[PDB]
């Protein structure tokens, strides 16, 4: 994938003000609530019985931070997103058996969440930059199939 | 399908948008065209440049239609079927495209009214967006 | 929607199927676990080896439910409410998985009834298969 | 992407035996018939007014056979799809702007077209060989994004 320079800078500046824990818990809570089947992969987490249960849950919040953090690894390495996610991909495809459509789903949610914390600051060029980033991370993870 | 609790959520957030239906309409469409450039291919006759006014009044139509389905939210399919013919048959629009617009509608909702796209709202909202997508893609399935 | 030609095309073929019911179900299942391995993880408890007594058993039960809604092809959603709770809420099946099963069962028909499976006939079945999925995923939209 | 021997054998073998022009035509017609929005891409094929018309169009069959010929290309080169479908990649993505998800649909349909023309000889083991083939192929056309 080829990164424009205007694009590197749009992903890079936004990134630098993201509260990873705030968006993390949120991305992930919304993934569980909005696409309820993803709940299955996360059942080790305890009570996911209602929406409130879900935004109530410590692990949901805590694992949200972990995720967003892993986005950081890509933003650190836009030219090597391929190998950043290569161990994360084994786990997601092999072990946990996640359908790659779900990464698309979390990347779309991610973007709704960044919209909502950054307002007019989450510019049309800027959203196009991010949609491509999450597109990429997702294919990065999805490598381990085809 | 759309439960009672969804239909409030939807109704509620629409009450809160309403005013801005033309601006949201147009930012929705602009963002779709910068983010999903293959989508322009269907508007070959538009001034697709920022600000254009065909965008402005197309995006008025878009969300007015949606606003409309919201008031007869009980029978969306009935309400919107005038738009299938055109979308499915005439324009032959790829179903992917509806998720796309739909996603950009949610982003516009989120920049202006983030406090209201609560996650429980977001979900009612996506169900509704699918329902719409489904009726315009209709007379395929 | 489901066109009365659709409702027709469908019947045509469920009646070619019929009492190959149980054989066809087993086979659709087998192709689904061998072609889409991750689908076996919903079956942690079954004997999944080619031939298996339970797979046969289960297979019949799927195709049965399928033949059952072909008998209310008019109100599928209702002929089948009972199973959405299962799939959607207890089991949390990912919708993608319904297209997988859907596809293995077209393959099965195609192997055993090629003649019967004409493009048009193939279209109607698809829409069918689609509705079923939608219903079975219904406590999701 | 790693191909076991059985997978190569199973693909190569069956391939041998394919009527490129009939399945090539059948595949293509099922597409336009089953997924009617696909018709928008083919209006330079004249009359697609109905299934029977789609079914008979000399240009559709004409094309049917081009497509499936190309799968053959794939078969000849399993370890090396990614490069073989670079140019068909630009065509489909930059020129025509075809959503990738319709590659999967086609693969899917190809597969029901083999099954109908091979019956029992299209064993489960065989179908998987091929699902992977078709899938590998539609990631190689959808490279030219992300
Ligand atoms: C989309 C971008 C994604 C990224 C960046 C990502 C990243 C991560 C990271 C960094 C970990 C844990 C490493 C560890 O603590 O072992 C993790 C684990 C996990 N992920 Fe993801 N992941 C992504 C999407 C998903 C998706 C869709 C799912 C599935 C619905 C998912 C389900 C899981 C589960 C079930 C674990 C194990 C949780 C546990 O530790 O108990 N990940 N991921
Ligand atoms: C929720 C989704 C949509 C709604 C509610 C919607 C609404 C409408 C309405 C009301 C019109 C016509 C107003 C009139 O009759 O002049 C229209 C036309 C049109 N729509 Fe959609 N549309 C939707 C989705 C899409 C998508 C995703 C696309 C493209 C991807 C699209 C492309 C078009 C085009 C090209 C026209 C023709 C208008 C012209 O030529 O000026 N629509 N749509
Ligand atoms: C054509 C769509 C489907 C139909 C018509 C169908 C039909 C049925 C029926 C009738 C039963 C339960 C019989 C009983 O009450 O014991 C059932 C159970 C079950 N179904 Fe499905 N199903 C469909 C799709 C799928 C898919 C894709 C999966 C997952 C891969 C799935 C997974 C299951 C599971 C795991 C059970 C539990 C059965 C047991 O443990 O005994 N279903 N299905
Ligand atoms: C699925 C894997 C696919 C393969 C291997 C494939 C292959 C090809 C080939 C080999 C050609 C001719 C190259 C040339 O002569 O320059 C071609 C042209 C074309 N294909 Fe595809 N294609 C695929 C998917 C699709 C899909 C899904 C569509 C529609 C949704 C599509 C539409 C077209 C069109 C519209 C043309 C050229 C128009 C013309 O030149 O007459 N293709 N494709």
TrEMBL record, chains A, D:
SUPFAM superfamilies: Globin-like (SSF46458)
Keywords linked to the UniProt accession: Heme, Iron, Metal-binding, Oxygen transport, Transport
Gene Ontology biological-process entries: hydrogen peroxide catabolic process
Gene3D superfamilies: Globins (1.10.490.10)
GO molecular function, one term: haptoglobin binding
Annotated heme b 1 binding sites: 92
One Pfam family of this chain: Globin
Chain ranges of the Globin domain: 2-146
Binding site for heme b 2: 66, 92
PANTHER family to which the protein is assigned, alphabetical: HEMOGLOBIN FAMILY MEMBER, HEMOGLOBIN SUBUNIT EPSILON
Name under which the protein is recorded: Hemoglobin beta chain
The species this protein was found in: Meleagris gallopavo (Wild turkey)
